[PDB]
Amino acid sequence: ELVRTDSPNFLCSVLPTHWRCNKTLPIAFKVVALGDVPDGTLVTVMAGNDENYSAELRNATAAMKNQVARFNDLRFVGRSGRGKSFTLTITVFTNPPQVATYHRAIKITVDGPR
Ligand SMILES: [Cl-]
């Protein structure tokens, strides 16, 4: 089950709306390229908001392999903040680079969904 991003050339797996800090994701994160994206193209993931430009993430780097970039255990270490969420920004380093944003924001707190 994939969802589209704000970029028509990219799709990605579904992420929770709210999750616990540093806890493994329920669904392994991956970015699917629909267009021309050569194998070996680096892809980085970044999370942040107004207060936090780039929050600490774990395993936020991957490389394209046959139109797919799989992230090995992506985790949100840093918390989004009280009453705030994160905006996931995907950057596919093609020539030139293409940026995509997750269709929705993700909240990261110490306890997670209560
Ligand atoms: Cl952080």
CA–centroid distance, residue 66 to ligand 1 (Å): 32
By CB neighbour count within 10 A (0-12 exposed, 13-18 middle, 19+ buried), where does 69 fall? buried
Q: Write the CATH number for 80.
A: 2.60.40.720
DSSP assignment of 6-32: SSTTEEEE---SEEETTPPPSS--EEE
Distance 27 CA to ligand 1 centre (A): 22
Residue 91: strand, helix, or coil: strand
Whole-number Å distance between alpha carbons of 17 and 51? 19
Distance 84 CA to ligand 1 centre (A): 13
Query: In which region does residue 26 sit, left (phi positive, over 0), alpha (psi from -120 to 50) or beta (all else)?
Result: alpha
Ligand 1 centre distance from Cα of residue 23 (Å): 14
Known binding positions: 52, 56, 79, 110
Q: Which range marks the domain in which residue 58 is found?
A: 1-114
CA of 76 to the centre of ligand 1 (A): 8
Number of domain units in the chain:
1
